[PDB]
């Protein structure tokens, strides 16, 4: 016989362990593989797909109305139109997105975000917007002269319907945490704001109000770490017909 001794951790059930285990059905032959469209092998492939931000998360926006922002012609120059909180851990416009829902299974994240806005006014509508990213440290900017000091794209409406604002990874640490403390220096990303650069200008027979759809995705420099249970789902009771699986 082989002399042995048992270590600490002998006989434990760790749910993340990786062993071989006894096959219950000997000589079983699985069904041959078939090619299926759309194999995914890394979840970073999913978060690179852009998906709609719920920017209009306001009362009296109902259902689909929460996925669009309405823009109107203004009579004052350089007005603020909207802002977007960037805290993916807290319940804001980014949470119910592809990048949002996958990232919330993880605790740490790094890398750049892409926001794309599609203008959905009429062909006859014209205008210029400025989209600004503000690295953290102070309050969200409320005036265009303050916001234009950050990273920004000036957007002219035209044949190409969409601009991207890249939100570059500007961080002291390698990672940020999905922290319920949104003001923590390990978690805060700063702000996105949109101002009128010129104005929304439309003719009489175009609709006077126009909508933006905003999208977000991760870039291919994006990385996630430390898997956790996602706070997006829970249960209190058993589901219906779950008891019946025992009857």
């Amino acid at each position: 016989g082989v002399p042995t001794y048992l270590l600490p951790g002998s006989g434990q059930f760790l749910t993340t362990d990786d062993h071989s285990s006894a096959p219950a059905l000997p000589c079983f032959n699985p069904t041959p593989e078939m090619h299926i469209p759309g194999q995914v092998r890394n979840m970073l492939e999913v978060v690179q797909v852009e998906s709609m931000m719920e920017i209009n998360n306001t009362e009296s926006a109902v259902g689909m109305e929460r996925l669009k922002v309405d823009i109107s012609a203004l009579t004052d120059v350089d007005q603020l139109l909207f802002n977007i909180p960037l805290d993916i851990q807290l319940d804001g416009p980014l949470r119910n997105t592809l990048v949002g829902n996958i990232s919330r299974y993880y605790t740490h994240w790094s890398g750049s975000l892409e926001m794309t806005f599609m203008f959905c006014g009429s062909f006859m509508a014209a205008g210029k917007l400025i989209l600004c990213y503000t690295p953290p440290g102070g309050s969200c900017p409320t005036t265009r002269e303050t916001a234009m000091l950050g990273t920004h794209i000036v957007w002219d409406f035209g044949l190409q319907s969409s601009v991207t604002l890249i939100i570059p990874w500007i961080s002291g640490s390698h990672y940020r945490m999905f922290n319920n403390d949104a003001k923590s220096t390990n978690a805060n990303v700063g702000y996105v704001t949109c101002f009128m650069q010129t104005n929304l200008i439309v003719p009489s027979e175009s609709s006077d109000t126009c909508s933006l759809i905003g999208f977000i995705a991760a870039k291919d420099d994006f990385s996630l770490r430390l898997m956790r249970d996602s706070p997006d789902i829970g249960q209190l009771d058993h589901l219906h017909a779950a008891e019946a699986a025992y009857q």
């Binding site: 078939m34 090619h35 299926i36 469209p37 759309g38 999913v46 797909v49 852009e50 998906s51 709609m52 931000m53 719920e54 259902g63 689909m64 929460r66 996925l67 669009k68 119910n96 997105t97 592809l98 829902n101 599609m118 203008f119 959905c120 006014g121 009429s122 062909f123 006859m124 509508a125 044949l159 319907s161 003719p203 009489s204 027979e205 175009s206 609709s207 006077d208 109000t209 126009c210 909508s211 759809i213 999208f215 219906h240 017909a241």
Partner: protein, 238 residues
């Protein structure tokens, strides 16, 4: 140049002058079933141009209150032309689809349609424990309307539906969308009367608007099956 497109299949052709490229779902193209993936051993019928052609469904009216529309494949085509006759006479079917969605308006109109092909779009019912019934699911050529497009009638979300193969129709930009669908199933063939591989969904995320005089703005759906195979010839279920 990516704005003009002609699709020709059998005796049918579509031209568009205002496309926005087109989608090939998951980068795939339809193919016939190869011998190393076959199950059923009878020699399949391959009708080609009799089935592999555009069928145009009844157009729907885009109104300010529209929640969106859906059509299930193969169900929406199961009673149309020689495609329908072959599905009625055969136990097994396989095909791809080329979907072309059409909606023109004026340069004074605005609005955006999400055009998305959803694989295995298993519907939920709202506010009940009872599963959707047969007549809720099986709609044929008319298709259905969304109850709650914001959760895609399945408790998920519209915002994330861009993970599925899609284009947009943005009336500013384009008047048509095109999606090419491969065979999308866990089995190599299926019984076409009891399982739908694909749901076409058309959802007005930005509502139709103008201040010109109103006209009816229809949305029109043309679907061509691609590489139709049928196995298990018998009498028509019909």
């Amino acid at each position: 140049s990516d704005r003009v497109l002609q699709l020709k299949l059998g005796n049918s052709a579509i031209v568009t002058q205002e496309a926005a490229n087109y989608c090939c779902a998951y980068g795939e193209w339809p193919n016939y079933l190869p011998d190393h993936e076959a199950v059923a051993i009878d020699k399949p019928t391959q009708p080609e141009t009799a089935t592999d052609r555009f069928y145009t469904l009844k157009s729907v009216k885009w109104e300010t209150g529209s929640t969106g529309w859906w059509w299930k494949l193969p169900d929406a085509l199961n009673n149309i032309g020689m495609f329908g006759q072959n599905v009625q006479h055969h136990y097994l079917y396989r095909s791809g689809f080329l979907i072309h969605v059409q909606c023109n308006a004026t340069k004074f109109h605005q609005g955006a349609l999400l055009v998305v092909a959803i694989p295995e779009h298993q519907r939920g019912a709202h506010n009940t424990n009872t599963s959707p019934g047969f007549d809720d699911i099986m709609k044929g050529e008319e298709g259905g309307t969304f109850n709650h497009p914001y959760v895609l009638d399945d408790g998920t979300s519209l915002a994330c539906a861009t993970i599925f193969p899609h284009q947009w129709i943005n009336l500013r930009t384009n008047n048509s969308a095109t999606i090419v669908l491969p065979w999308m199933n866990a089995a190599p063939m299926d019984f076409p009367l009891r399982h739908n591989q694909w749901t076409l969904a058309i959802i007005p995320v930005v509502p139709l608007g103008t201040r010109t005089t109103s006209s009816m703005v229809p949305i029109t759906v043309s679907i061509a099956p691609m590489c139709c195979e049928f196995n298990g010839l018998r009498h028509a279920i019909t």
